[PDB]
Structure formats: C-alpha cells, structure tokens
DNA sequence: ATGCTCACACT
DNA sequence: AGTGTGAG
C-alpha cells in the first residue's frame, strides 16, 4: 500500500496579514486590538482582518466596524487605501511579494493567496539530511514547533506541553534511517523554522505554518497552533486527528460537497469516511471526488505544489449593493473606466516586473435581483494596455444586457462590475 | 450592504 | 466560451 508519505509539504499563513502590514507601518498599533476596515462611511466600514488581541473580544472578519466597537470599545482601526472610488490593495500585494521572495530562497513556492503559500520541501529536506552526517536533531532547532498528538501517556502551561510533546517525538526519532517519513517531516520543520525566522528578521512579519506530507494536511496543521507557531502532522497522527475532525474543516469540503458528504453518508467526522469502499464514495460523489475522499480520509492526497509564485489573472471589481446599484448608462461607463484605469496600472507594472502580457479581457456583471455571484461573463481581446479602450471594449460586450428601452437608462441596475485580464504570454 | 479578489472543474 | 464552486 502506498501511504502518502512521499513528500514534505508546508503551508505558511501570515497571521492577520493586513493588520501586520499596518502595524509595521504605524507602531502605535502594535500589540493592540486592531482591525483593518474598508469603506468607513457604511456602518464604520467592513472589517477584513483582525489582530489576535481584538479576536479575544469576539471581533471577526466580515463584521461591521460599528458592531466590532460594541464588542471591543478600545478597538483601533486602519483603513484600506481608496483610489478611484474603490479599495486599493497595492500595499498588501507589495508586502506579499516581500515575503514570497524570501520564502523562494528556501524551497519551491506555490502562492495560494495574498497571505498564504504552499512550500514543497522534499528536495530541501534531502540536501539537509546529507549535511547531517547522522547527528541528532536538537529541540533547540524547533523552538516554536508543536507535534500534533503529543504529549501522550503515563504540566499545566502551554509551553510545557509543547516541549514535552517535542521531547517525546525527538527521543523516539529513528535518525539512522534517512528514508523515514517522520525524520523527513522533522527536518522539514527545522527548515520551516529557519524560513519563518528569515521572514520575521527581514520583514518584521510573523506567520504560522503546518508541515505534513501533502497540502491538505499542511493546511489543517497550520491552523492547529496560532499565532506565530508551527505544527507537524505526521502520517501516524491522522487516525486520532481525523476521529473528531468535522468534515467541513478539510480543504474543499467547507461548502456544498462537504455538506452532501455529511448528509448522504450520515457522518460528522473525517475519519468515519474510512468505512466506505472507494466504489461507494464514487457512486455518491463521482469518480474524481470519490477517489479523492477515499484517499484523503486516510491522510493521502497528491495535489502537487505548483511552481507558481505569480497570479495567473489580474482582476479589478466593485460591488454596488442596495440603493447604490448603477441604473444609468454613463454611470456604468464611468465605473468601467475606473476599474480599467486601476487594471491598466497593475498590468503595466506586471509587464515591467514579470516579463509577460495579458491577451484576454474578461468582463463580468451582476444585475439587481439575481442571486449568484456573477450574472454573466463575456470576454474580448486585450490588445493594448489602454484604460479607455479596455473600458470601451468591456461596455461593448455587455451593452446588450440593458433591458431598458431607453438608451441612457440602465435596467436592471448593475450590482457588480468586474474586469479581469488573463491568458498571459511571455513578453 | 463586510468586500475584493483568485484558482479549478464541468459542460 | 460560459457557469458553478471553494477559498482567503
């Protein structure tokens, strides 16, 4: 049986990243209950990132700042830059590039979002096990590492539990066998400690990490001990870990498919999936999903860390909810020009930085009354980085959606505009 | 009326 | 090409 122990994979998550960026810039915010908001006028603004000191009062993402101030009256707020009437996340994108360039010195990186990256450590671990002669790994090389599932068997503070688990792990490690998956994970954790130290020294930013044998376990592991800590989930820890792990906590099972798994099979925890045959799971959820679930509930997953540090699309969108839905033609043309101008700015920077050009322009809208994220998607050729042509072209491909018989009223009103540049080629 | 993004699979 | 899903 192939046991899903072939790779060493990490997931790095910058703790409340947008908050850390504002705290670095403004020392008055450091070590305080702090949140980042956008659009201050409506209910004090929408919270998009929350410091751990503020989370202790119950402040969360997606809260209105006016409501968060009820939970935490001393909450400090930083607001996202606004440019051309919309939130502008350039500062956080630039900080993200800072961190990812440092991570890239250690191993192969897949950018997962602005604040998360997967790390393929398999080759870096091999090189390091050769430089290691055959010498023990000291607990001093793992000063922020938790071993999930330990300590076990025959201390009242969190740091003493951490070290007792690490001691039990290390005392048991079979360091003579350079083939042992547990040893390989441990060396991987040593490298992640070094990577996280380098990020903090060179940027000031802290992060948490998970180290395991695949992306799903690494991501799960990273959330186990936060903030500014890292967790190693071994193959052997999976049966106990999954025995009480709600299905919705595993990456890609937090939405409709995960709910169907729960409801069709009559189970609650990831480990309960082991009692079904692969054919049974495929019959309920399809060939691909069924095979994936059969392997995943045993801790096995093969999605590669893709060598990809740059986004594949560059996009710009704004929502127009409630009374603010766009209902005139010049209004729609105005906001398209606004999105096209920010898009041109970011595209030009991308071409200068990363030696590539986008070739397709995707336009998406949502109309008032519709229920889903996007009402309609249309595309055209992106031949020149010119905001006025891009906005003119985007209007052309959507102007037929105007049900209004009047030419300069727009009905139904538009609740969302979206411009995305894609289909990049080397330049 | 948190938002603004980004990747991938189905057809 | 256009849609639906899942995520930060």
Swiss-Prot record:
An example GO BP is: error-free translesion synthesis
Q: Which UniProt keywords apply?
A: Disease variant, DNA damage, DNA repair, DNA replication, DNA synthesis, DNA-binding, DNA-directed DNA polymerase, Isopeptide bond, Magnesium, Metal-binding, Mutator protein, Nucleotidyltransferase, Nucleus, Schiff base, Transferase, Ubl conjugation, Xeroderma pigmentosum, Zinc, Zinc-finger
Q: Which residues form a coiled coil?
A: none
Instruction: Kindly report, in one word, the top-level EC class recorded for this enzyme.
Output: transferase
Which positions bind Mn(2+) 2? Answer: 13, 115-116
Activity regulation text: The enzyme in complex with the DNA substrate binds a third divalent metal cation. The binding of this third divalent cation, which is coordinated by water molecules and two oxygen atoms from DNA and dNTP, is essential for catalyzing the DNA synthesis.
How is the cofactor bound here?
A: Binds 2 Mg(2+). Prefers Mg(2+), but can also use Mn(2+). In vitro, can also utilize other divalent cations such as Ca(2+).
Quote a single Gene Ontology cellular component term: cytosol
Result for mutant: residue 62 to G = Increased DNA polymerase activity and translesion bypass compared to wild-type
- PTM comment: Monoubiquitinated by RCHY1/PIRH2. Ubiquitination depends on integrity of the UBZ3-type zinc finger domain and is enhanced by TRAIP. Ubiquitination inhibits the ability of PolH to interact with PCNA and to bypass UV-induced lesions.
Cofactor(s) recorded in Swiss-Prot or TrEMBL: Mg(2+); Mn(2+)
Residues reported to bind Mn(2+) 1: 13-14, 115
Binding-site residues, Mg(2+) 1: 13-14, 115
Mind telling me which residue stretches traverse the membrane in this protein? none
Gene Ontology molecular function terms on file: damaged DNA binding; DNA-directed DNA polymerase activity; zinc ion binding
Residues where a 2'-deoxyribonucleoside 5'-triphosphate binds: 61
Catalytic activity, as annotated = DNA(n) + a 2'-deoxyribonucleoside 5'-triphosphate = DNA(n+1) + diphosphate
* Positions bound to Mg(2+) 2: 13, 115-116
Instruction: Report the EC code(s) recorded for this entry.
Output: 2.7.7.7
Q: According to its UniProt entry, what is the function of this protein?
A: DNA polymerase specifically involved in the DNA repair by translesion synthesis (TLS). Due to low processivity on both damaged and normal DNA, cooperates with the heterotetrameric (REV3L, REV7, POLD2 and POLD3) POLZ complex for complete bypass of DNA lesions. Inserts one or 2 nucleotide(s) opposite the lesion, the primer is further extended by the tetrameric POLZ complex. In the case of 1,2-intrastrand d(GpG)-cisplatin cross-link, inserts dCTP opposite the 3' guanine. Particularly important for the repair of UV-induced pyrimidine dimers.
Disease annotation reads: Xeroderma pigmentosum variant type: An autosomal recessive pigmentary skin disorder characterized by solar hypersensitivity of the skin, high predisposition for developing cancers on areas exposed to sunlight and, in some cases, neurological abnormalities. XPV shows normal nucleotide excision repair, but an exaggerated delay in recovery of replicative DNA synthesis. Most patients with the variant type of xeroderma pigmentosum do not develop clinical symptoms and skin neoplasias until a later age. Clinical manifestations are limited to photo-induced deterioration of the skin and eyes.
Annotated family: Belongs to the DNA polymerase type-Y family.
Domain comment as written in the entry: The catalytic core consists of fingers, palm and thumb subdomains, but the fingers and thumb subdomains are much smaller than in high-fidelity polymerases; residues from five sequence motifs of the Y-family cluster around an active site cleft that can accommodate DNA and nucleotide substrates with relaxed geometric constraints, with consequently higher rates of misincorporation and low processivity.
Write the protein's name. Answer: DNA polymerase eta
Span within the full-length protein is: 1 to 432 of 713
